[PDB]
């Protein structure tokens, strides 16, 4: 019954044809949409050629199911070398992104509780409240000033600003100033610095080190600079934090990272390390969807107008304890399943099998490489009938996974979860938001998956 | 690709034009609804130069005012055309004001070097006057077409009641094509300075 691993479908490309139009061209954007098409035409399932190591790219729940029911004690995903290699150049510890094995299960343990917990997101909730609400209360300022009382601008600046905003404040209890002000160079520079980062992941990931070493050695030298300007962002946050707490403990709640401090299960070094890995992954992929959700909300007026209602509704509960806002806005955690569903940030779930395994009918062998291509799966029409419709409700209800599945499944989801929820939330109760641009928003691929236009919002107060 | 504004045009295009614009920039009746506005701004300026004033032990400010002029004419000339309140007065100079002061600057002088001279002669005698002309023109129109593609989806969403500038009247009465109201938004905002 069962089928050998190379019964399987052929991808037609290169690992070597790929390596050149990445060089020549300087990234791979498109390969969200080339890998949609293969799939098409291929079925749900077909191996790549990596010239002896062995992928699988997979597309349904059904299989997703498959794979974790395979998740070992030590879930392996590939080693991402050029940002690994940045820990070994400079001699830095792994965070958990990076990290596999029992050093994976030791550090991920230890997080866990106050990053991820319940307990924890009703400690940090609070917080990210009142960045959100800042936010909203800057851009009622400024509309107000206008005679037709709206405001019609790119949002995606002041959108990126405040998931470094809160996100700061959840991770470090410090408050920059930086919702209803304008950007600071140290702000710039770090979101240039990220989009380099990835920019160069994607030019060096596709080919080995012995290659790209003389292939594009200042491609390297572009990585390793933005490292230095991201680890340099991050280290300053610690700095501060790790001095204050030297100098006394606080008995109120003062942040995601001072609860790891103050506990001291992490050495210094591993705390550093997923601090960095918190402060920069907390930025691109929640100012992304949340950017996404309000330009889906501005091209369905009724969805809209539903979650407006929901978030009126829930109002007064809401600030009187934030806490709740879990609880009392369904509707629009729905809305952000629905967002990932179409636009996700991630755009694949990878395990390193470590056991012998079967897919839609095919032998996996042992130690190949499992990639779960999310873009397809939620665009899967057979699952998400009419997938290219907007409609929350599709989750009022494993068709859900944009932040992966079992004990690897992302550590900061709750707190994206809560920055982004937060935010509509305050922006719905105040603002109507509206476009002429109907027309869909090409995507992108660099590392992360990302909008390659950003369109004009007219947020207009009522 | 553009149309040519009443600054720019002859014959009965430009009366078509200008009699459909007179109502609205030029009127007595015009004016009665956005000097409420221009007056908001200017009272503005004043309260914060007296703010900047009192702060000094001699209460008093010596300044070259050129910039904070420049920044007022672009804030009051806004509003009344465009009923936006940018945040040009008592506040810095943002880099899009400035790159607007810069290449209506630019335009001119340029200007001045390119009229004296038929096409046929500029063309190979000073290409590169030609190509610093035109970038100024986009930096120009840039701005301007800002502006426009602003209030012109707002106003598709809803038409409102009051008075909000002279491009609202201009767009809600729709007696001059798109492009046509385009084309004099722009002259008005480049020529507002
Ligand atoms: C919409 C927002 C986000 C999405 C869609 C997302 C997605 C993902 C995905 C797909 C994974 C792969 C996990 C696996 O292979 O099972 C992951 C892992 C991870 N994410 Fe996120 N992420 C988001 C936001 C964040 C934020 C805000 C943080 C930091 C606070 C973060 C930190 C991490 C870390 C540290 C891991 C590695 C966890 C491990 O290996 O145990 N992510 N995320
Ligand atoms: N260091 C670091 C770091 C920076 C950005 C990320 C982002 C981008 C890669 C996918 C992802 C999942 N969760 C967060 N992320 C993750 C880690
Ligand atoms: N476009 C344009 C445009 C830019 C500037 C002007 C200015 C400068 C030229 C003389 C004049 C009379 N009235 C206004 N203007 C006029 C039009």
């Known amino acids: 019954t069962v ?9 037609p490309g290169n690992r070597w044809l790929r390596l050149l139009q990445i060089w020549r061209e300087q990234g791979y954007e498109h390969l969200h949409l080339e890998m949609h098409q293969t799939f098409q035409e291929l079925g749900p399932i077909f191996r790549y050629n990596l010239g002896g190591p062995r992928m699988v790219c997979v597309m349904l729940p059904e299989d997703v199911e498959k794979l974790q029911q395979v998740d070992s004690l030590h879930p392996c995903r590939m080693i991402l070398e050029p940002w690994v290699a940045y820990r070994q150049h400079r001699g830095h510890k792994c965070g958990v992104f990076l990290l596999n094995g029992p050093e994976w299960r030791f550090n991920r343990l230890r997080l866990n509780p106050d990053v991820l917990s319940p307990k924890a997101v009703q400690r940090f909730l609070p917080m990210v409240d009142a960045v959100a609400r800042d936010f909203s209360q800057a851009l009622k300022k400024k509309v107000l000033q206008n005679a037709r009382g709206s405001l019609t601008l790119d949002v995606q600046p002041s959108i990126f600003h405040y998931t470094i905003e809160a996100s700061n404040l959840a991770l470090f209890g410090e408050r920059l100033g930086l919702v209803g002000h304008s950007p600071s160079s140290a702000s710039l520079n770090f ?37 230095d300007c991201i680890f340099q962002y991050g280290d300053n946050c ?4 790790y001095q204050e707490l030297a100098f006394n403990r606080p008995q109120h709640y003062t942040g995601i990272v001072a609860e790891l ?9 591993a705390i550093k390390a997923n601090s960095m890995e918190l402060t920069a992954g907390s930025v691109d992929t929640t100012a992304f969807p949340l950017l996404m959700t309000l330009f889906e909300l501005a091209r369905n007026p009724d969805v809209q107008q539903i979650l407006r209602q929901e978030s009126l509704a829930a109002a ?24 990932l569903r179409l636009y996700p940030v991630g755009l694949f779930l990878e395990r390193v099998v470590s056991s012998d395994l079967v897919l839609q009918n095919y032998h996996i062998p042992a130690g190949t490489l499992v990639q779960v291509f999310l873009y397809s799966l939620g665009r899967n029409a057979a699952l998400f009938p009419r997938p290219e419709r907007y409609n929350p409700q599709r989750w009022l209800d494993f068709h859900h996974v944009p932040f992966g599945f079992g004990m690897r499944q992302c550590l900061g989801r709750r707190l994206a979860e809560a920055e982004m929820l937060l935010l509509l939330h305050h922006v719905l109760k105040h603002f109507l938001v509206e476009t002429l641009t109907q027309e869909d928003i090409k995507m992108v691929y660099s590392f992360i998956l990302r909008p390659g236009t950003s369109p004009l919002l007219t947020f207009r107060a009522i």
């Open 238 to 241: 610690i700095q501060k934090i």
């Open 3 to 11: 089928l050998p691993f190379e019964a399987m479908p052929q991808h």
């Open 316 to 339: 007064a509960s809401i600030s009187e304890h934030p806490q709740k806002a879990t609880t009392e806005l369904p509707l629009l955690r729905a809305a952000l399943k629905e967002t």
């Open 261 to 269: 401090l103050l506990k001291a299960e992490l050495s210094l070094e």
């Open 191 to 227: 979101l240039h610095a990220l989009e380099v980062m990835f920019k160069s992941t994607v030019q060096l990931m596709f080919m080995p080190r012995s290659l790209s070493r003389w292939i594009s050695p200042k491609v390297w030298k572009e990585h390793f600079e933005a490292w």
